[PDB]
Design an enzyme around this catalytic site. Structure first.
Site, PDB file in Angstrom:
ATOM      1  N   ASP A  34       0.707  -1.378   0.073  1.00  0.00           N
ATOM      2  CA  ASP A  34      -0.105  -0.008   0.030  1.00  0.00           C
ATOM      3  C   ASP A  34       0.865   1.363   0.019  1.00  0.00           C
ATOM      4  O   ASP A  34       1.454   1.603   0.874  1.00  0.00           O
ATOM      5  CB  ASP A  34      -1.028  -0.037   1.222  1.00  0.00           C
ATOM      6  CG  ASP A  34      -1.755   1.101   1.145  1.00  0.00           C
ATOM      7  OD1 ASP A  34      -2.402   1.447   2.295  1.00  0.00           O
ATOM      8  OD2 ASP A  34      -2.148   1.981   0.200  1.00  0.00           O
ATOM      9  N   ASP A 214      -1.411   5.818  -5.857  1.00  0.00           N
ATOM     10  CA  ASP A 214      -1.695   5.034  -4.873  1.00  0.00           C
ATOM     11  C   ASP A 214      -2.184   3.364  -5.162  1.00  0.00           C
ATOM     12  O   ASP A 214      -3.445   3.331  -5.418  1.00  0.00           O
ATOM     13  CB  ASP A 214      -2.743   5.498  -3.691  1.00  0.00           C
ATOM     14  CG  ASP A 214      -3.369   4.601  -2.620  1.00  0.00           C
ATOM     15  OD1 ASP A 214      -2.236   4.031  -2.071  1.00  0.00           O
ATOM     16  OD2 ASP A 214      -4.476   4.279  -2.176  1.00  0.00           O
TER      17      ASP A 214
HETATM   18  C1  LIG Z   1      -3.451  -6.893  10.230  1.00  0.00           C
HETATM   19  C2  LIG Z   1      -4.575  -5.997   9.811  1.00  0.00           C
HETATM   20  C3  LIG Z   1      -4.213  -4.534  10.265  1.00  0.00           C
HETATM   21  C4  LIG Z   1      -4.516  -3.650   8.986  1.00  0.00           C
HETATM   22  C5  LIG Z   1      -5.329  -2.309   9.755  1.00  0.00           C
HETATM   23  C6  LIG Z   1      -5.387  -1.244   8.687  1.00  0.00           C
HETATM   24  C7  LIG Z   1      -4.530  -0.224   8.802  1.00  0.00           C
HETATM   25  C8  LIG Z   1      -4.623   0.875   8.198  1.00  0.00           C
HETATM   26  C9  LIG Z   1      -5.724   0.949   7.088  1.00  0.00           C
HETATM   27  C10 LIG Z   1      -5.839   2.426   6.377  1.00  0.00           C
HETATM   28  O1  LIG Z   1      -6.098   3.251   6.742  1.00  0.00           O
HETATM   29  N1  LIG Z   1      -5.358   2.303   5.125  1.00  0.00           N
HETATM   30  C11 LIG Z   1      -4.821   1.206   4.428  1.00  0.00           C
HETATM   31  C12 LIG Z   1      -5.804   0.314   3.602  1.00  0.00           C
HETATM   32  C13 LIG Z   1      -5.191  -0.474   2.389  1.00  0.00           C
HETATM   33  C14 LIG Z   1      -6.250  -1.303   1.822  1.00  0.00           C
HETATM   34  C15 LIG Z   1      -7.277  -1.374   2.246  1.00  0.00           C
HETATM   35  N2  LIG Z   1      -8.325  -2.201   1.547  1.00  0.00           N
HETATM   36  C16 LIG Z   1      -8.221  -3.529   2.095  1.00  0.00           C
HETATM   37  C17 LIG Z   1      -9.071  -2.292   0.161  1.00  0.00           C
HETATM   38  C18 LIG Z   1      -8.385  -1.350  -0.637  1.00  0.00           C
HETATM   39  C19 LIG Z   1      -9.316  -1.092  -2.099  1.00  0.00           C
HETATM   40  N3  LIG Z   1     -10.180  -1.953  -2.323  1.00  0.00           N
HETATM   41  C20 LIG Z   1     -10.622  -2.842  -1.365  1.00  0.00           C
HETATM   42  C21 LIG Z   1      -9.972  -3.134  -0.125  1.00  0.00           C
HETATM   43  C22 LIG Z   1      -7.809  -0.736   3.239  1.00  0.00           C
HETATM   44  C23 LIG Z   1      -7.015   0.261   3.916  1.00  0.00           C
HETATM   45  C24 LIG Z   1      -5.613   3.523   4.150  1.00  0.00           C
HETATM   46  C25 LIG Z   1      -6.557   3.166   3.012  1.00  0.00           C
HETATM   47  C26 LIG Z   1      -6.975   4.521   2.403  1.00  0.00           C
HETATM   48  N4  LIG Z   1      -5.802   5.077   1.945  1.00  0.00           N
HETATM   49  C27 LIG Z   1      -5.985   6.346   1.326  1.00  0.00           C
HETATM   50  C28 LIG Z   1      -5.048   7.119   1.098  1.00  0.00           C
HETATM   51  C29 LIG Z   1      -5.193   8.193  -0.095  1.00  0.00           C
HETATM   52  C30 LIG Z   1      -4.031   8.363  -1.007  1.00  0.00           C
HETATM   53  C31 LIG Z   1      -5.652   9.646   0.767  1.00  0.00           C
HETATM   54  C32 LIG Z   1      -5.080   5.511   2.958  1.00  0.00           C
HETATM   55  C33 LIG Z   1      -4.241   4.112   3.637  1.00  0.00           C
HETATM   56  C34 LIG Z   1      -6.745   0.306   7.437  1.00  0.00           C
HETATM   57  C35 LIG Z   1      -6.655  -0.978   8.012  1.00  0.00           C
END
Ligand SMILES: CCCCCc1ccc(C(=O)N(Cc2ccc(N(C)c3ccncc3)cc2)C2CCN(CCC(C)C)CC2)cc1
Length: 329
Positions: A34, A214
């Site tokens: 990510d 991203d």
């Molecule tokens: C062992 C499990 C622990 C993980 C806990 C967790 C940590 C961080 C995030 C998160 O905010 N994330 C990370 C994250 C990655 C993928 C997902 N999922 C799974 C996803 C993405 C796309 N489609 C479907 C599902 C969810 C959350 C965000 C997602 C949004 N991003 C947007 C940035 C933008 C450029 C402004 C910032 C980071 C979520 C959960």
């Protein structure tokens, strides 16, 4: 050549995953790679919630190199908390290893039903330092500091379903991944991987927009005035009160996105942002495009842009390089 290659496997067009390992007993996990976050999140054996019980789990006690740190980590996610504590251990990505501050996750009671739905165990961030919890140095920056990679840079060449597999590559740029010139676009902030481009879709134009590249986003997100303007008269149907737009897959009125800088010009054609629901031609499709308003006009160039364009994320030169991905491997 050198360079650390990490195979990306696709999961039904929604996401892709890579393998990494934790501890010197080589505990295997599946990770979301990510570029929009800056921490390594791993599920603990001490996590006993439905779902954790479906995931691969981390056990510090099986690992000679575990190094207690215990520092409490609390994250009140959208109605439901995600919590854990810091740990240090030996992380292995591809054929490289290094000690790293990650977050051993104890509770996932606000990351549902997302977590159980999907088949990843953890999330591995690849953003900048100033975006992390604690003040952790990015994995790739560290690997460069410890002299294990030639350059402080990684690249993404994304999987394309039923076509080829993909790679995250650490340490240098591999020619086989692309065609045409590789142009560079300087960061405008060391936080996300964000650059300045002019966005233009036919008549509609927005000068000098903030574009975040991203891997963690599966749509193209677009400022809502942009979206509204650009969907008029396209024979698209909006499902009421949900961010979904339905169209025949052959709708020849669908527009092409245009991003320009002094250095380069990037386009994203209909075939890159359509999700196929069914292909009994003319097919039913959804637009992989979300309206989303940031304090400043922003585009999230996520998975759909990255599927077409091979991308270089460079910590040393503070920039993103973009080139057309090779259609095949
Ligand atoms: C062992 C499990 C622990 C993980 C806990 C967790 C940590 C961080 C995030 C998160 O905010 N994330 C990370 C994250 C990655 C993928 C997902 N999922 C799974 C996803 C993405 C796309 N489609 C479907 C599902 C969810 C959350 C965000 C997602 C949004 N991003 C947007 C940035 C933008 C450029 C402004 C910032 C980071 C979520 C959960």
């Amino acid at each position: 050549s050198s360079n650390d290659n990490i195979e990306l496997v696709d999961f039904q067009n929604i996401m892709f995953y890579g393998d990494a390992e934790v501890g010197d007993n080589q505990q295997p996990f599946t990770f979301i790679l990510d570029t929009g976050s800056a921490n390594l999140w791993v599920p603990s054996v001490k996590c006993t919630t439905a779902g954790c019980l479906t995931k691969h789990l981390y056990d510090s006690s099986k690992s000679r190199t575990y190094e207690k740190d215990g520092t409490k980590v609390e994250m009140n996610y959208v109605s439901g908390t995600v919590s854990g504590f810091f740990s240090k251990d030996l992380v292995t990505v591809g054929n490289l290893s290094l000690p790293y501050k990650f977050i051993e996750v104890i509770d996932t009671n606000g990351f549902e039903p997302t977590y159980t739905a999907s088949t990843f165990d953890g999330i591995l961030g690849l953003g900048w330092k100033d975006l992390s919890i604690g003040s952790v140095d990015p994995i790739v920056v560290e690997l460069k500091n410890q002299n294990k990679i030639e350059n402080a840079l990684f690249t993404f060449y994304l999987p394309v379903h039923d076509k080829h597999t993909g790679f995250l590559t650490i340490g240098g740029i591999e020619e086989r991944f692309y065609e045409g010139p590789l142009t560079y676009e300087k960061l405008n902030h060391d936080l996300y991987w964000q650059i300045t481009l002019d966005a233009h879709v036919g008549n509609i134009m927005l000068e000098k927009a903030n574009c975040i590249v991203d891997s963690g986003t599966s749509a193209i997100t677009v400022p809502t005035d942009f979206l509204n303007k650009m969907l008029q008269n396209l024979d698209v149907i909006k499902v009421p009160f949900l961010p979904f737009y339905v169209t025949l897959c052959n709708n020849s009125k669908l527009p092409t996105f245009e991003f320009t800088s002094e250095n380069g010009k990037y386009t994203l054609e209909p075939e890159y942002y359509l999700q196929h629901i069914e292909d009994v031609g003319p097919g039913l499709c959804m637009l992989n495009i979300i309206g989303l308003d940031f304090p400043v006009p922003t585009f999230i160039l996520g998975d759909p842009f990255m599927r077409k364009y091979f991308t270089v994320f460079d910590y040393d030169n503070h920039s993103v390089g973009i080139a057309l991905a090779k259609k095949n491997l």
